[PDB]
Amino acid sequence: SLAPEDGSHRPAAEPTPPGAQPTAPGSLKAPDTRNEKLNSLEDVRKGSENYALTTNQGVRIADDQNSLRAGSRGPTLLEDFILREKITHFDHERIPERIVHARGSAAHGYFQPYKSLSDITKADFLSDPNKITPVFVRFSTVQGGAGSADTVRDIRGFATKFYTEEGIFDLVGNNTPIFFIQDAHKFPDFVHAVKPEPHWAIPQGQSAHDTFWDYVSLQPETLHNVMWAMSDRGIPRSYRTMEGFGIHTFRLINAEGKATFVRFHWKPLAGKASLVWDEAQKLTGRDPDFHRRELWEAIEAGDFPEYELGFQLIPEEDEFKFDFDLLDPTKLIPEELVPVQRVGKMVLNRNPDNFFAENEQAAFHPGHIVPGLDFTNDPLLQGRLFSYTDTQISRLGGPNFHEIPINRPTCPYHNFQRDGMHRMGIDTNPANYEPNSINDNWPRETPPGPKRGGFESYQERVEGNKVRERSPSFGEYYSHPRLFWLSQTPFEQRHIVDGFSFILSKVVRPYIRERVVDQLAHIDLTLAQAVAKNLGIELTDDQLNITPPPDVNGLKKDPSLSLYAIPDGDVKGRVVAILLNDEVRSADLLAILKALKAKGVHAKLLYSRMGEVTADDGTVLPIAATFAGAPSLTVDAVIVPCGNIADIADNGDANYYLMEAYKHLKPIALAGDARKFKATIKIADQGEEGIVEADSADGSFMDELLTLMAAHRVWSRIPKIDKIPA
Amino acid sequence: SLAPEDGSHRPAAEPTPPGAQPTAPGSLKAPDTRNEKLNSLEDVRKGSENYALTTNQGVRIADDQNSLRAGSRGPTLLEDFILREKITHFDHERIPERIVHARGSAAHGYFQPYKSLSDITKADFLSDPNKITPVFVRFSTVQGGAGSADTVRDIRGFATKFYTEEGIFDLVGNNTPIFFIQDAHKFPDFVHAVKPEPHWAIPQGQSAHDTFWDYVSLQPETLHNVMWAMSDRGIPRSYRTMEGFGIHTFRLINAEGKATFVRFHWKPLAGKASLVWDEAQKLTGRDPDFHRRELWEAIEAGDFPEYELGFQLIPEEDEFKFDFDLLDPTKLIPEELVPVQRVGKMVLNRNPDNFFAENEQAAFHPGHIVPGLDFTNDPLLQGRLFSYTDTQISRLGGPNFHEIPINRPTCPYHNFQRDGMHRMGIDTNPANYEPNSINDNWPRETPPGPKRGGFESYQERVEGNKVRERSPSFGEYYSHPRLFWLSQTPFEQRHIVDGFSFILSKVVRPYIRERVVDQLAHIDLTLAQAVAKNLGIELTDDQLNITPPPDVNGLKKDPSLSLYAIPDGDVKGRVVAILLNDEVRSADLLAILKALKAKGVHAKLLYSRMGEVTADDGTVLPIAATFAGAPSLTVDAVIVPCGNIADIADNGDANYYLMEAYKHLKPIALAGDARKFKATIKIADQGEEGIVEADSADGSFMDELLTLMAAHRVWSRIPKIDKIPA
Amino acid sequence: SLAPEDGSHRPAAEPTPPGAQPTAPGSLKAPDTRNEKLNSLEDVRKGSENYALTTNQGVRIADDQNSLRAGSRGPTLLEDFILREKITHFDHERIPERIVHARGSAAHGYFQPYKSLSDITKADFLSDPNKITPVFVRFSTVQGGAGSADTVRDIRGFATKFYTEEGIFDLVGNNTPIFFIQDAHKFPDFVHAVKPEPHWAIPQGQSAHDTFWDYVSLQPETLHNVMWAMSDRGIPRSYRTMEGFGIHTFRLINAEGKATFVRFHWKPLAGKASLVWDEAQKLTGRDPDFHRRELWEAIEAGDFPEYE
Amino acid sequence: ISRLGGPNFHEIPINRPTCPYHNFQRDGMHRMGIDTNPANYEPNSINDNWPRETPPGPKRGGFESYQERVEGNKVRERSPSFG
């Protein structure tokens, strides 16, 4: 038998910290985590243990190692149906990846409201706090292929499928509150410009190329989302630590028929946190699956991703009360003007069993609404409603994609639609049309109503000529980018400048760089000059003279637009690298591990080889990874306990570990003779804010380090990192 | 509520004769008819009564009569996701039809062996007479599309899927015991020659065109199956009244590893019966769905199609004992040489619920065998094994077609195949490869053995060089055609001559007709002369002198090759037209209807209009159809009861009804004054064989009519019909 | 050589009456008949005479009569790439038929206006009586599949693709001047009710069944087109002898921007003529390809279908 | 067949031979080539059997497999020489 005697092949079916066990299909890892959607998938889950290997026709296979041949050195025979079924299935495994958002990672969970919303919406899923709705959520990047890296600079997708009692609602959002373009007719142009260029299909997962910046320079409506992408919002630490937005204004409709405009928000209960660029880019090379891994291992540990759903609500009479058009998806609604009302909480608590069957095949579409919601005339939303139904026809093979298990509603569905490729449902209705007498008109229409009623559009007044024309109210491009800029902390503004500077340096045609700097000068001169200086460009007098755009309804900043201005840090689910030596001070390691456990912070024990080392008191410590195998890129903070520090003092890899973490603004803590490493990061004898140092690891050394971790990164260190060659 | 208040819209859920009630889905017509496969389809059967109409996402629809528009006379809006989901699904309802056998009709049933065959085969489904195997059978024509007519002249397909406990076994046969060609490499040539011609796509459902006979004239191997297609075997009365054959020699393998050669047969328990050509061709116009309809209505009546499986068995030591090669699919094995041993019984006892989902998506493939069976080197079989797997990947949309509910095994299936379009099964196995340790190598290979073993091929010796070469043993083309011809009755030989004569008359290029006639002269000079005379062709002295091919192992005829030489008539399930008048003798009608009921023979009451007529004694007679609506083509015999004959005596439709029935050799019975119709069909005063006549329908009138019905048709009338203008 | 000595295997490349010669591909039957669209298809026309038989990769085949096997009575070998290519292509011949109007018959031709219509429309194809526009036209039935019969009782389609200098215009019409239903939302209902019923897939090519009349009886907007279908309009003699209509009101827009409402009509220059029902129905059995054949043969004879 | 959408992938321009190709195969999704041969089968007489098979030869001949000797039983077995 091939499994090891000791049973160490099999992960424990209990939550465990990252790296402690091999990861596993969600139903094997967490068999008692259930919701109505996960339970309904039971009819299609297939096991394996104790079953005979068969063909797809149920024929048991005797020899799965050899083709059938004429003699054991002879030709393969065409009658080998076993070989050919197995190779045919393999030959046809792939399906088209998504046209955008092809790279994505997904989990099961549930949603529950905090109170009934029946005064604003008759949506059944929001009617009662004890109504639990299963969800399936997929997070994604935008530009790269399904095989591209996770920690690129990109917008991120945040798509949620609610399996409600009155239908599937998909909330298909992103991690920034606006889009790049105004009208869906432009989407193939913008997407072509950002995707790999058509001659040579370079670059992957990057906007750092001429075509993108050509389009941006000629389409200033893109400048607002460009500012977000260039900020640290473009490189989140985790899907758990980014915001989500629906972007468009939609409508809530109550049982009285009153419409309220809404924009949707997701607020991360782990707080907001992003990488820095150098770290992000390096992480695409050292772990291109970092975000997929982080999400799966968080759920396996019980560090469930949690988000609060939020609504910005604007009465119908206030449609024209702002400086910008509510229908314009390049404009955000500042939370200073319209606060976010917190409406419920979503928890993602179970990984899929099979990536392909549940994540790759999942189909989300913003036109999947339910009674109690309605659309608006936002012209980007309007065109999206067409695109998602259409693309699913080729990507998923035909018009029965709703019968793919992950996409099936959990509520009833009955109608007169029939056939299509890979039809699963076998209809018994004598009628396949209505009106019909032969089945007494079943299934029947249902009038709209306050609950379980049929869908009826809000009777919005339409008045105008049939025109292909952009609303003049959408023609203002610079005041939102300026508001976002002025709402950033000084360090966030510096990262924006550096984002633009690094990227535009990779544009080959210099006039495109100059055209973009000209657009920046319409937003903010300080920004425009700081980017220009890095590109060797000089602003003209005309450019130094452009009048700033106006404030937004009297606002010259909104701190809700910054990642870091208002503290919201949570250390639960973060990870620290502990750099070991061959006789660790065991009292340091006890203290550290204890303090980390108390806050839900994981640790990884690192050394120069695998296996184990022995602590001063004889404790055997198991090594998780090498210095070079689990780089500082992958952790939040680094601790070096006392002991035989000469063992690692001259280890290039250990030195570099600390140089890299320092450069990336991560908290570092040094105990006892570990303080010899201060030399490598150039720290004055008297200490520096963000380096924790003491004679040993006592309770106070840990409180200080965990305080640095709650603030995420040590922004005050930025002017000091220039001198470190890392 | 649109249903009539009397509930007449819904058919009774109990057996009823053809036409008595509207037809229905099999689970609503016969809910208590169950088998293991029909029970396993419960998970995908969808009802309808009492359910709300929804989108495929489960959203209730309020108004399924209107698109969303800006104003009730305004333009339709892109945001109507309900209109677009409904039209998108409709727009994608069609899938490719089968490349051959596109037109076919199917039903569910079950099979049981009469005794255990474990001495000759370890096949589980043949191991125990109390083992019931569910089946799904599809009957088909070969050339025409899925919308072509049923009663064309063509070979028929007879495909049976056995859902066994050790795997699906598909026995994919035809209604003749040989095929047209020897090696699969020719199959696209042959099928292209018989299909509609490629410039204009004509003719549908017919071999009566130049390309077919061009290929035949140049490929004498085809002549044997051509003889059968030109005979009345090419125009079966019903799928219930044709034979089936697997054509190829296969092997049975027993638990001791002994191989026995086998050819598969199905014998129709209802007997063998065919139409005549003019009737068949007329019926393609008046009811192009006649065989589909007859199959479905026989099942709803309780007249279940029954067939007996039988095997012709030949020991391995006797492979070379015949004048023909066992591996040559253009050669039959005469039952006089190798008798068919009865093996078991198949009953088809339930119709599908949804034709598309179950019939159209069904996939049969002769490579689907189970342990206990194996292949031989028949070069036509060997190529089929490649084709069915391949075609199904495009027809059914991908490699997961075994997950379509009709195709699923009822036994366990587990393996390491993953993904593909339309993937339903969600695999939870940690491993997707073997050998593996992480799942202790499950699912595991199973050694071969007497029961529940893995499949291993019979270790047949192969010896020879890699060649593209036809075996010289296959190089004989005329002896089997001659054996078939000499085995037919004189009236069957007349119909074969008429078959060739009518069909070659449609070949436009006369030299092709002359080439076919020359091939006939190598089969039998009497056949060749009779066909030449009809075509205005004179055989040359050379042709008159071709020597006949040899007898087949000493045989000069085998009566098992004729439809009619050995009586096997069965009247149950047949149908008689009764031509009413406005004052029917009610005592005639009582005697006629009860005698037919007692033998399971159906009746259809016909008149010149719909509604009712009233018999001499006041009995109200409900009319099934008019004389034009339900022509004689659709019944087996015609009865005219006494009454007011002058009512119908001058009705051109009634007279022509009898003229057509008479021409087509059907029994006709005339009571009382109905004898006045003797002048219409030119019957002598003292009467003639095949016309039943009496003063009333009492005494022996119905027994005499039923005796004629058991003989099927009045062959003795053939020389009398040439004169009547019908 | 397999052809007969006298050359009678090959139809004359001149106009001939129906039945005088075997029918043939248009470019072989009428090589001097050309238009801009027929010429443009030259890049993809493939001949055959004097060429070697090859795989799709251009490899010449020596023996197209046999699979590769180990001995001449032995098993077929997986390395036979010639057999597998030929059988792969055959196995993948079919594509889905059209959801409606799956049975149809088509020909090439040309159009030209009698006079410029520039007062009412700027459409370039209507701008000059001497500017000829190629067309491709398909006629069809509605309900039956691609292999159903021609002379059923049904509405007929009349679809014309005009290959204009300013883009393709498709006029996709039928042979009666109205449709059965008012709103496209109901089309899948109406089509389902007319098509073969879902349990047993019967009847083909026929509205003579319960579901269709159930729908009609509950949707009186259907009655107009039902009248046309029940008249001898439902059974035309030929596609040359029926009317065509676009059904919907469309607009014409001239250079000054003026809109005029328009309905489109085709008038058959051969006249209007239909079968009688007993004839139509028997002809579905004796020649289910009657209209397809009659159209192709009229064109081979020089009796070109003409419409106004 | 599934990656490139059907059996006519040799007609996608990059995959096309530059040398002649002619046979009796027809149809399939995405069919570009418009065949004018009156026959779509062989042997035929109606187009004098063209396009025709070609015997093997030193240049420009038909493909024939090398006539390697095959001898053994039908087995699913690795050759011991591979172990």
Ligand code: HEM
């Ligand atoms: C506010 C603007 C938009 C946002 C927030 C948005 C968000 C997303 C997200 C999150 C996904 C990935 C869903 C998944 O995980 O499977 C997605 C996929 C997609 N988006 Fe959008 N998108 C926007 C605009 C558009 C526009 C204007 C179009 C086209 C008109 C479009 C067409 C698509 C298509 C074709 C896919 C692939 C869907 C699939 O294959 O199932 N997107 N988008």
Ligand code: HEM
């Ligand atoms: C003894 C000779 C043969 C018999 C008895 C036979 C019988 C049949 C039958 C009954 C069907 C229809 C199964 C159904 O109802 O779905 C069928 C379909 C098929 N046949 Fe065969 N056949 C023969 C030879 C061949 C050969 C030589 C090839 C190709 C090498 C072939 C390729 C096909 C294909 C592609 C289909 C359609 C299968 C599908 O789409 O699922 N047939 N044949």
Ligand code: HEM
């Ligand atoms: C005025 C009413 C209509 C007329 C005159 C009409 C006419 C036709 C004709 C002549 C064709 C066949 C074109 C060809 O030869 O390939 C066709 C195909 C079709 N029709 Fe319409 N039709 C009408 C209404 C509709 C409606 C309301 C819909 C759906 C909303 C529709 C959907 C289709 C579809 C899906 C096809 C198949 C087209 C293809 O596969 O290329 N038809 N129709």
